[PDB]
Design a binder for this molecule. Structure first.
Ligand SMILES: CCCCCCSC[C@H](NC(=O)CC[C@H]([NH3+])C(=O)O)C(=O)NCC(=O)O
Ligand SMILES: CCCCCCSC[C@H](NC(=O)CC[C@H]([NH3+])C(=O)O)C(=O)NCC(=O)O
Lengths: 219, 207
């Protein structure tokens, strides 16, 4: 079992939870709750750059979201059939990462900038990101983003579609193929399981969860 | 067939690609975005997936996103390790590199009232977090390269960053002998030595 070291929160570990679950991989979690928990991880040499996320997997102690995700996707054949498909996957998911990052950091936005930043995220979703992925899907008409088979790109995108829905459910309304992809991926047995109550899937981060993490870093 | 790099005539988010291609001895062309109307043509022509540069035309693709570009180039030219686990170490290393790189990249854009405090935090992380981390990797095996005893993208990305740290503060590397030794070795590899010489596609600091 892979062991995920993070707070009991989405943050920078949630995409890994999604990917592992989608891949049908059982995993364990060790939740950081105190500064002492982080002290131990840091002191035991568990964190290369003294940060989490960190995943213990196949004898490695992997930090950096992308190192973790790239390893898991390759292992479970969700990173395409070759270098060219991996390139398309990388391009798609890094756009997904860019949008993901804006939403992720939204609750730490300066209050006086919050209105404008939300308006910008929504604008970008409407005009930049959703059209881009809608375009890819219409280009080949296939059930999956790349190579006509399930890959990390479908998983990463659909995870993001759930977050966009949380933000504003109307944003996906003019994108039928994204909606269709959301439905298809959500019905894959592993993902259907992950979306159901009782799975390691984390709730939206509230102020309390945010502050507990800050206190743990003693910021 | 020759890769074409679409970006401003500047380092920015394209410089690490220029470094990697040059290090791999791969000939490329650049098309410089000189104005807002240049960028709009690329967008309107459907050249940019997310309406952003960098973009590299390579092997029938219009690859946007720095990491997609670099990941493809590294694999194509055997600078991405031999197996899944070596790629994991490489990714871990270069993502730490990309994090520090990002702080230095954005420092000129930092609001003037926050500039001094941002710089102090960057220097503190270099001396206490990042440099020790890579010094440790080098010391762990005593080999000339970060991964697999063989030139990889990790060496190229790190040494590029060492150059930027030097520009920022030449004293920062002083207590890390192995990083100093890596910088020297990589800078003297034929392809990289040529890239560091005048008249190469290597770009200057922003003025
Ligand atoms: C609501 C805001 C969400 C912000 C996410 C914070 S994740 C915690 C943070 N880790 C990172 O920023 C790691 C980033 C790294 N690039 C990665 O992707 O793994 C940390 O350990 N920080 C401690 C430190 O840097 O000292
Ligand atoms: C001082 C140097 C700081 C970096 C300069 C910005 S690079 C230009 C910018 N590109 C990006 O932000 C691409 C980011 C993307 N995540 C990547 O890695 O390629 C752009 O095309 N912007 C246009 C847009 O987003 O519409």
């Amino acid at each position: 079992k892979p062991k995920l070291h993070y707070f009991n929160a989405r943050g920078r570990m949630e995409s890994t939870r999604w990917l592992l679950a989608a891949a049908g991989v059982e995993f364990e979690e060790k939740f950081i709750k105190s500064a002492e928990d982080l002290d131990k991880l840091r002191n035991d040499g568990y964190l290369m750059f003294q940060q989490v996320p960190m995943v213990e997997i196949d004898g490695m102690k992997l930090v950096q979201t992308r190192a973790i995700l790239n390893y898991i996707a390759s292992k479970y054949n969700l990173y395409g059939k070759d270098i060219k498909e991996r390139a398309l996957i990388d391009m798609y998911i890094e756009g997904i990462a860019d949008l993901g990052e804006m939403i992720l950091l939204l609750p730490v936005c300066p209050p006086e900038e919050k209105d404008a930043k939300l308006a910008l995220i929504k604008e970008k979703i409407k005009n930049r990101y959703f059209p881009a992925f809608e375009k890819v899907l219409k280009s080949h008409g296939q059930d999956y983003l790349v190579g006509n088979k399930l890959s990390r790109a479908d998983i990463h995108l659909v995870e993001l579609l759930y977050y966009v829905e949380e933000l504003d459910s109307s944003l996906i309304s003019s994108f039928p193929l994204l909606k269709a992809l959301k439905t298809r991926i959500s019905n894959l047995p592993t993902v259907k399981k992950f979306l159901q109550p009782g799975s390691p899937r984390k709730p939206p981060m509230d102020e309390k969860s945010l502050e507990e993490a800050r206190k743990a870093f003693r910021f």
